[PDB]
Amino acid sequence: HNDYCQHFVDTGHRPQNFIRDVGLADRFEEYPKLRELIRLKDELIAKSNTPPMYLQADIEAFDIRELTPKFDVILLEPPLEEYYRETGITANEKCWTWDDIMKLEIDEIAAPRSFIFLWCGSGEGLDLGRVCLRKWGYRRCEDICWIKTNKNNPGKTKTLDPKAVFQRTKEHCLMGIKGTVKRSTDGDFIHANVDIDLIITEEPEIGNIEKPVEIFHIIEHFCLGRRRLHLFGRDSTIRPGWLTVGPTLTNSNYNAETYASYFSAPNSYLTGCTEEIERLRPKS
Amino acid sequence: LFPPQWICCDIRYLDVSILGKFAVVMADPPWDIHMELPYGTLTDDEMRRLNIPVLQDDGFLFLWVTGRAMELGRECLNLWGYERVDEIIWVKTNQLQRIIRTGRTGHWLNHGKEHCLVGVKGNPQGFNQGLDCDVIVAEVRSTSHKPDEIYGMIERLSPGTRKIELFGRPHNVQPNWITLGNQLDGIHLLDPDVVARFKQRYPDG
């Protein structure tokens, strides 16, 4: 019986520890055409990226409409209390309840055709994040799970949520869609089926709240929209191609006029595509 | 506690009140996911009306969900009297412990996993929290078999209690479980209390 559930009971190695080739590099080491599709798409993203822009803002008091132009993708990472109750560490910023998150006026800054990626944790947020998506005018359409391995520190970890039945070893990033998008007709807006809905990395260091950087790769590969917003980002998450807005940023360079100029004439808000990528990407 | 028991039946019409109460219910229903499928489905209203509530006073529900049933399943779980308290994912691997990353296996992103909602009802006693992780890693086997690892997880959660599986096939029969499904081999019941109630309710058959 190659039962990895039993093996976890017996040894403390999580079943996910035995999934092979989960890194960004080793997954397509043996598959040159698969690797080439990713390499060319990453080059397309880098060639068309805006320089990083970022704004310190207390989002609870902020008029979100001050962020312009509208966004093709929004990555939302509100600091949930559960991130700190489950690790035990004291937060150095205000934690956000799901009521707090719901109050955000995300629909006022989303482009009419656009996507959202909402980090929901592993408890009640799987349900309440869906309510937020409804409130903001999105349909839940995928669930990207961040599965955490414990290869370096095998053992159990007590889940503190008193309602939990199992040991919680993953976090969910819900994906929502706004507007009408057809993957056969709208290839200038999305490249579907380039990535899978799983990110597998080792559990972070004791006091580390960062999410895996691969979430950016999945978003950038999927949507050709260049207007990308990361709400509740930090100094450490600043990234070309993204506008980062959050309370703990130490500096601000955002200029709404300059930011918008990167996407208006003679530029486009879409990356475009090359003939080499069009011949390689998955299509009907 | 008994060896495997099963009832070949249409679950929409079986009077499940004859089966008694169970510490764990598990179901893998053919949800209407609003797409053409090579198997028949149950309508949303047929799912809502399943008499899940009589099967349990205190205990757990395991409900497999996919597509639009991520939301419809949550509706059913709450309607049947449960609160969702966990979500198991089954990561599907190939023969060499790798995820198959290619093809077009979802509508927007490719799919490497299946989801199972975990609900609780009432005040169950005699259960063991935190023995297993909420991630199963297993190859896909034969004709759409959900992973057999789930039975061991559930047995460690609730050892030695009676359990019921809905939409099960012959491979799913297990000791301590009663299995319901329309591709089972007739009717095989061993609990004397269940046998007695079955004869009353269906004197013919």
Ligand SMILES: Nc1ncnc2c1ncn2[C@@H]1O[C@H](CSCC[C@H](N)C(=O)O)[C@@H](O)[C@H]1O
């Ligand atoms: N109304 C109904 N009543 C009883 N069984 C039904 C049913 N509708 C579909 N089924 C059956 O439910 C089964 C779904 S296949 C279920 C998969 C199972 N969990 C596994 O691990 O393999 C099929 O045998 C199907 O014929």
